């Protein structure tokens, strides 16, 4: 866990030591930030990391630490490169989609000093909408962000490699392992059959790039970190309009309109119509988010961790095919505004021919008040969606 700098024959820039021994999340949050130090310091120019990793496994949450930790830094996210007129398919894990061309004319202008214009990309639309001007940061220091972070085309380029592995990405083959276990068999050996039908493209294309990193990150997953810091949702059968909503809450609340389709997913075998833990397939602007649907009622409350993480459709054939069944097919659409701290929406399910008022938020004193502002109180129905079909059979 000690960093330590070697000329890299190549050139005459240091390099990091590679750490074999894999490293924790905590641990190797701070090995990435004293190796900036030191990089800076025995380095001229920029300081380009590329940080690696499967959809789930914490890549996004550790940027954002980093961030906060320091905002001299500037985080580019390489799945703003994406082009979709090169693939027909819309897997976000497909590694045809980066274009490198300006990809790596980006970061040859910040290595010469350059602003750069960065490329923003809109899933929902699937095009390039725009570009962003970034400069060369305060500290220097530029992380590239991607499953494909650590491919041959990015290497040469790159001043440290960063691999980030497991979270609730290996969490969920844990958790299929839960369900489809059998007495007899090898738990490393179906693990490995669960990781192949369920994510066809990590053994193949995304780990190989991974062993190459300097820093390897495994983040273990806390089943009990969610319910420390969970979502309390406020749900009502009351008939606030969005146009209400508008004037009531303050300014700061943005107004937006979504479509969301959820695929409820049972385990496999036999759930008496209870005892089940539903697996929610979400799709939302162009995304697929696999949901972990673990809820507690405290009236008026139901609180959930939310814990999930963006997916292929793909997933959904895997699991299917290891024996989860579709159990229903919920549509919505929904008027959202959001204080980026509380959000209120109003949603439409086409099951139900009816219309509920949600406040949801991770503070719960929040949700309380600002429910009690709309003249919640004595509408609240707490159940989810689906529980809520189940009751009206």
């Not at 490198?100 to 095009?127: A, E, M």
């Not at 139901?302 to 549509?331: C, D, H, N, Q, W």
Request: proline share 5%; hydrophobic share 35%; glycine share 6%.
């Amino acid at each position: 866990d000690q960093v330590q700098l070697i000329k890299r024959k190549d050139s005459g820039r240091y390099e990091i030591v590679p750490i074999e021994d894999p490293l924790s999340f905590e641990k190797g949050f701070y090995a990435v930030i004293r190796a900036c130090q030191l990089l800076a310091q025995k380095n001229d120019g920029l300081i380009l990391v590329g940080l690696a990793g499967p959809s789930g496994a914490g890549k996004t949450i550790f940027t954002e630490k980093i961030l906060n930790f320091m905002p001299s830094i500037a985080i580019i996210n390489m799945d703003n490169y994406n082009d979709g007129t090169r693939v027909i398919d819309g897997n976000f894990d497909d590694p045809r989609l980066t274009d490198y061309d300006t990809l790596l004319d980006n970061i040859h202008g910040l290595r010469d000093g350059k602003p750069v214009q960065v490329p923003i990309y809109d899933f929902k639309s699937s095009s390039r909408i725009g570009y962003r001007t970034l400069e060369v940061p305060s500290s220097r220091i530029v992380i590239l962000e991607g499953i494909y972070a650590l491919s041959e085309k990015l290497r040469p380029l790159l001043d440290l490699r960063v691999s980030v592995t497991g979270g609730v990405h290996f969490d969920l083959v844990k958790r299929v392992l839960r369900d489809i276990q059998r007495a007899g068999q090898e738990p490393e050996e179906i693990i490995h059959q669960i990781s192949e039908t369920v994510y066809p493209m990590y053994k193949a294309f995304i780990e190989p790039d991974l062993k190459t990193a300097q820093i390897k990150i495994l983040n273990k997953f806390n089943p009990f970190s969610g319910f420390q810091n969970p979502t309390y949702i406020l749900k009502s059968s009351k008939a606030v309009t969005p146009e209400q909503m508008k004037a009531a809450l303050s300014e700061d609340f943005k107004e937006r309109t979504e479509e969301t389709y959820d695929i409820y997913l049972l385990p496999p075998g036999e759930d008496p119509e209870a005892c089940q833990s539903y697996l929610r397939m979400r799709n939302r602007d162009g995304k697929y988010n696999l949901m972990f649907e673990e809820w507690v009622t405290d009236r008026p409350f139901i609180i959930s961790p939310r814990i999930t993480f963006e997916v292929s459709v793909r997933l959904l054939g895997g699991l299917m095919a290891l024996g989860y069944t579709i159990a229903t097919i919920l549509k919505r659409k929904s008027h959202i505004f959001d204080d980026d701290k509380v959000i209120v929406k109003t949603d439409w399910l086409e099951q139900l021919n009816r219309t509920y008022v949600q406040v949801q938020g991770k503070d719960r004193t929040f949700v309380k008040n600002v429910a009690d502002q709309l003249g919640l109180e004595g509408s609240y129905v707490p159940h989810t969606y689906i529980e809520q079909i189940q009751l009206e059979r």
